[PDB]
Structure formats: structure tokens, C-alpha cells
């Protein structure tokens, strides 16, 4: 993701991440989801009764299409390593149904929602490093 691609040019990062979702079902479909960020340290939230015990928000589908759930920068170190590392654990963002999407007569019974990620104004990244995301065949020459 744009956020990711950028973080990947640096070594450390700090800040809060903004997860915003846009439900694209039919106007006629209702429902209440539950987005959640559980900071590291315990059994990863497999069920709702566990995700609900951490940072969460009960999103009610309605006229307001989108809904954001923020991942409050909660960390032990002040900066997290960009590369994957256990010391710099991030946490678990999951989702569940608070109730269940409900549609009526003649209404598409299955649809989707788009998930976006962005950084909050308290976000900063440091230590310029090269990015792994691109490769290049050792250049020819002429010898």
C-alpha cells in the first residue's frame, strides 16, 4: 500500500494507523460490523468475545458509507522496525459481525467492503534505507 511502499524506504516508524472501510453493498442492506486492534502480547483474537476486549469500534452501516477505526500508537519502544521483528510486534486488527448484514426482498445477498490504510498526523518514519520491493538484473556491460 502507499503507506507501506513509503515505510519501506525507511528503517523505523512511529505513529497511529488509520484503517478506513467503505461498505459497498446495496443501499438496502443493513448490518453492524466490529473492527478491532488488539495490541501484542496475548493469544491472537480468533473469536469476537476476544477482539471485543481490546481497542474496537462497532460500525453501523448506514448513510455514512465509510467508517474509520484507529490503531492508537501503543508500543513499548518509541520506534518500530520496518523489517519484520518479534521485539517490535504490532498487534492484531480483525473484524467480526456485531449482528449480521441483513437484506430484504430482491437484494444482492453478498457484497464487499473496501479497506484503506493511511497514517495519522503523529506519524513519522526515519533512517533512509533502500527498498526490497524492486529488483534489477545485473547490468550488461560491454567488456
Amino acid at each position: 500500500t502507499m503507506l507501506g511502499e513509503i515505510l519501506n524506504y525507511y528503517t523505523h516508524w512511529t505513529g497511529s494507523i488509520r484503517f478506513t472501510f467503505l461498505f459497498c453493498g446495496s443501499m438496502m442492506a443493513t448490518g453492524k460490523l466490529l473492527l478491532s486492534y488488539s495490541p501484542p502480547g496475548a493469544k491472537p483474537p480468533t473469536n469476537r468475545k476476544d477482539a471485543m476486549l481490546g481497542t474496537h469500534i462497532i460500525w453501523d452501516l448506514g448513510l455514512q458509507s465509510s467508517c474509520s477505526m484507529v490503531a492508537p500508537w501503543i508500543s513499548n519502544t518509541v520506534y518500530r522496525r520496518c523489517a519484520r521483528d518479534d521485539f517490535t510486534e504490532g498487534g492484531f486488527i480483525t473484524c467480526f459481525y456485531q449482528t449480521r448484514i441483513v437484506v430484504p426482498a430482491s437484494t444482492p445477498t453478498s457484497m464487499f467492503m473496501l479497506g484503506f490504510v493511511s497514517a495519522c498526523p503523529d506519524f513519522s518514519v526515519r533512517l533512509l534505507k533502500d527498498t526490497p520491493h524492486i529488483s534489477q538484473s545485473k547490468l550488461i556491460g560491454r567488456t
Partner: protein, 68 residues
């Protein structure tokens, strides 16, 4: 013709406040007639994320209905 400026707070440095001592001053004297020859332009932390995160015509404020 030298111009002194503030350094970038280091390890055992001024509380982030960058307002402690002249021991954080670096001198600069451009030597060439062509600007192009100069060091990196001074760090500019200005920014307007909005031209990208909110280039919407009518302005909407968080606490309100995005779609009124």
C-alpha cells in the same frame, strides 16, 4: 559572509528544544559563484497534506455528517 545556523539535535544533546548553547551552531560559507554548487537546501518541515487527503470543494469537519 559566513552564515551560522542551528545543528540537528544529536545524541547527548539539548532537550529536543534545540535551544541550548551555541555548541549547536554550524558555520557555512558558500565558495562558488553558482548556487547549484551549494549544499543541501535547509531542512523545510512545512507541509499541506490536505491538497492530497482532502481536496474537497465544500469543507467538511470531522464531527459532522460527511454527507449532509
Amino acid at each position: 559572509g559566513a552564515q551560522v545556523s542551528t545543528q540537528k539535535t544529536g545524541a547527548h544533546e539539548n532537550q529536543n528544544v534545540a535551544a541550548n548553547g551555541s555548541t549547536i551552531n554550524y558555520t557555512t560559507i558558500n565558495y562558488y559563484k553558482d548556487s547549484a554548487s551549494n549544499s543541501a537546501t535547509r531542512q523545510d518541515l512545512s507541509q499541506d497534506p490536505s491538497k492530497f487527503t482532502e481536496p474537497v470543494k465544500d469543507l467538511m469537519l470531522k464531527t459532522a455528517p460527511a454527507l449532509n
